[PDB]
Design an enzyme around this catalytic site. Sequence first.
Site, PDB file in Angstrom:
ATOM      1  N   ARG A 291      29.181  47.877  28.683  1.00 15.54           N
ATOM      2  CA  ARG A 291      30.430  47.944  29.556  1.00 15.54           C
ATOM      3  C   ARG A 291      31.649  47.410  28.836  1.00 15.54           C
ATOM      4  O   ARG A 291      31.629  46.069  28.613  1.00 15.54           O
ATOM      5  CB  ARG A 291      30.217  47.054  31.048  1.00 15.54           C
ATOM      6  CG  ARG A 291      31.324  46.882  32.047  1.00 15.54           C
ATOM      7  CD  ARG A 291      31.004  46.976  33.384  1.00 15.54           C
ATOM      8  NE  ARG A 291      32.402  46.975  34.173  1.00 15.54           N
ATOM      9  CZ  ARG A 291      33.211  45.799  34.536  1.00 15.54           C
ATOM     10  NH1 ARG A 291      32.624  44.731  34.338  1.00 15.54           N
ATOM     11  NH2 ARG A 291      34.334  46.288  34.724  1.00 15.54           N
TER      12      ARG A 291
ATOM     13  N   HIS B 236      41.425  46.550  33.170  1.00 13.24           N
ATOM     14  CA  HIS B 236      40.867  45.451  33.508  1.00 13.24           C
ATOM     15  C   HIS B 236      41.915  44.567  33.268  1.00 13.24           C
ATOM     16  O   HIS B 236      42.264  43.784  32.404  1.00 13.24           O
ATOM     17  CB  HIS B 236      39.835  45.202  32.508  1.00 13.24           C
ATOM     18  CG  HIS B 236      38.752  44.277  32.860  1.00 13.24           C
ATOM     19  ND1 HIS B 236      37.530  44.108  33.191  1.00 13.24           N
ATOM     20  CD2 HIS B 236      39.120  42.926  33.236  1.00 13.24           C
ATOM     21  CE1 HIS B 236      36.748  42.838  33.196  1.00 13.24           C
ATOM     22  NE2 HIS B 236      37.924  42.292  33.518  1.00 13.24           N
TER      23      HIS B 236
ATOM     24  N   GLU C  22      38.153  44.751  39.637  1.00 15.60           N
ATOM     25  CA  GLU C  22      38.577  43.707  40.416  1.00 15.60           C
ATOM     26  C   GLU C  22      40.210  43.608  40.757  1.00 15.60           C
ATOM     27  O   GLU C  22      40.915  42.770  40.627  1.00 15.60           O
ATOM     28  CB  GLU C  22      38.357  42.259  39.861  1.00 15.60           C
ATOM     29  CG  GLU C  22      36.867  42.221  39.481  1.00 15.60           C
ATOM     30  CD  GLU C  22      36.753  40.893  38.982  1.00 15.60           C
ATOM     31  OE1 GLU C  22      37.430  40.070  38.634  1.00 15.60           O
ATOM     32  OE2 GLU C  22      35.463  40.455  38.871  1.00 15.60           O
TER      33      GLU C  22
ATOM     34  N   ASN D 159      31.032  43.330  40.955  1.00 10.71           N
ATOM     35  CA  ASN D 159      30.892  42.101  40.150  1.00 10.71           C
ATOM     36  C   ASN D 159      30.648  40.892  41.030  1.00 10.71           C
ATOM     37  O   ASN D 159      31.356  40.301  41.869  1.00 10.71           O
ATOM     38  CB  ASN D 159      32.440  41.952  39.520  1.00 10.71           C
ATOM     39  CG  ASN D 159      32.670  42.884  38.380  1.00 10.71           C
ATOM     40  OD1 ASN D 159      31.792  43.712  38.059  1.00 10.71           O
ATOM     41  ND2 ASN D 159      33.603  42.681  37.689  1.00 10.71           N
TER      42      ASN D 159
ATOM     43  N   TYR E 250      29.075  37.033  41.421  1.00  7.91           N
ATOM     44  CA  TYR E 250      29.034  35.666  40.951  1.00  7.91           C
ATOM     45  C   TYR E 250      28.312  34.502  41.676  1.00  7.91           C
ATOM     46  O   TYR E 250      27.261  33.812  41.544  1.00  7.91           O
ATOM     47  CB  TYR E 250      30.040  35.245  40.050  1.00  7.91           C
ATOM     48  CG  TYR E 250      30.326  35.935  38.723  1.00  7.91           C
ATOM     49  CD1 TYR E 250      29.911  35.498  37.582  1.00  7.91           C
ATOM     50  CD2 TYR E 250      31.241  37.074  38.715  1.00  7.91           C
ATOM     51  CE1 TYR E 250      30.147  36.307  36.333  1.00  7.91           C
ATOM     52  CE2 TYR E 250      31.632  37.820  37.681  1.00  7.91           C
ATOM     53  CZ  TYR E 250      31.256  37.421  36.424  1.00  7.91           C
ATOM     54  OH  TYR E 250      31.384  38.037  35.234  1.00  7.91           O
TER      55      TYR E 250
ATOM     56  N   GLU F   7      28.983  43.011  36.572  1.00 12.14           N
ATOM     57  CA  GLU F   7      29.289  41.946  36.076  1.00 12.14           C
ATOM     58  C   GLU F   7      28.235  40.621  37.002  1.00 12.14           C
ATOM     59  O   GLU F   7      28.240  40.718  38.081  1.00 12.14           O
ATOM     60  CB  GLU F   7      30.679  41.305  35.998  1.00 12.14           C
ATOM     61  CG  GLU F   7      31.565  41.942  34.996  1.00 12.14           C
ATOM     62  CD  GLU F   7      32.805  41.253  34.954  1.00 12.14           C
ATOM     63  OE1 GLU F   7      33.148  40.091  35.216  1.00 12.14           O
ATOM     64  OE2 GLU F   7      34.076  42.003  34.823  1.00 12.14           O
TER      65      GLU F   7
END
Length: 475
Positions: A78, A123, A169, A310, A312, A383
Amino acid sequence: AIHRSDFPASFLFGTATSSYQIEGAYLEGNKSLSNWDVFTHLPGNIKDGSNGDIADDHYHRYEEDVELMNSLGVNAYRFSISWSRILPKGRFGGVNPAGIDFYNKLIDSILLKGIQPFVTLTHYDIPQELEDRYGAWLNAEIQSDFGHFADVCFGAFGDRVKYWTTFNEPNVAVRHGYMLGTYPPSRCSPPFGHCARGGDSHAEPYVAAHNVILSHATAIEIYKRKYQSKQRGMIGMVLYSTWYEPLRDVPEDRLATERALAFETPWFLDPLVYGDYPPEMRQILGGRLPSFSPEDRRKLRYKLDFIGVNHYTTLYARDCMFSDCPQGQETQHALAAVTGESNGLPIGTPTAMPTFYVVPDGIEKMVKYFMRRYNNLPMFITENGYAQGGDSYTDAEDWIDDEDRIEYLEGYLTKLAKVIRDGADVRGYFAWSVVDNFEWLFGYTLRFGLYYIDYRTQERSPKLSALWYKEFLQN
Ligand SMILES: O=C1O[C@H](CO)[C@@H](O)[C@H](O)[C@H]1O
């Protein structure tokens, strides 16, 4: 604990990067200055006063990095395309053949090793010129610029690229850029801050997001009308996807948690799947969310093929609708406040990245939230990862000994395999990141890489997590 065979046979396993964070060569090959080039050369933004001028020098060292990926046994990679390399002056300025050449070579290198491209168009980065000309995401003209950028990339690379992401994002980039004013173009208003350029934190973020949504819609209409039947790829959007739990298990915090969630990823995903902003958002913001015209709605019928998750961390959410909370946080308009603590205990093990706690079941819960809201639309974990930083690390050996990253990856992958067994249509996983890189406002002070980078020499060295991930992918 967790193994390759615990996931489907055709699952994508890779790593993730972005162009500004790794490439360097910021003025080579006729590339124009991006927003982040300009931003990082101003004082008072980046924690260590660093920039992305050189970064990992991936522009020159890409082949070594592809070989390292290959030695881990990944089947995908990616990455993002620097808009400023492809169309240095935007859509009337001509395609830059040197940019085209660089990405062709990169795509061919990874495909030679059986590694599938998974490409992000944008991005965080734009050519500064688009900001200077018409204020970038504050003007509907950006939709045509982004449309053209997308069209060029599809035409040049789409014979070999089968997975595309429009934006990474935009929920983060828009709020940081236009609400808090901590990312370029550094715009905000009270009570979020005093930005010398000006702004309106109650209006501009919603205008910017509106144009991002419609830029996506323009791009995917182009893809499906022009390229999809020949190229047979999938086009999605990547969103920053934090899981939220109610601070106290009472209705007002539960409702606040639902608001916090709805104000993040559905801000973008509801329009793209259902053709309207989230009702949770509409109820509070009303006319601050712009309308979708008939023309807009026609493009929105192309929707998206997948959700790029994404994920986390996980945080507690509490009500601010019926309690007075500190103003000026990004969650202000959602009338929720978020925290990683309950009663002097963190929600999970703290890490060097602020707000990032080790909470594996967050990935399961986030995926199930998407499943229920979007009827199990395909997902990729685009991610997931862990940062090292701070006083504890003085030499290479300290950074290389990353059993803490191993424990994170193992825990989250365990919960990911579980949610897939439970029916989630998740189709891949990308570890952020293959290499330590420029971590936006944190500069080089946070290191997410599977490979350690000595920035004096550009030497790549495997951390223990690189060896772990290799062993995992060998089954
Ligand atoms: O969500 C993200 O996490 C990463 C870690 O904060 C960051 O480097 C990426 O650019 C961003 O997409």
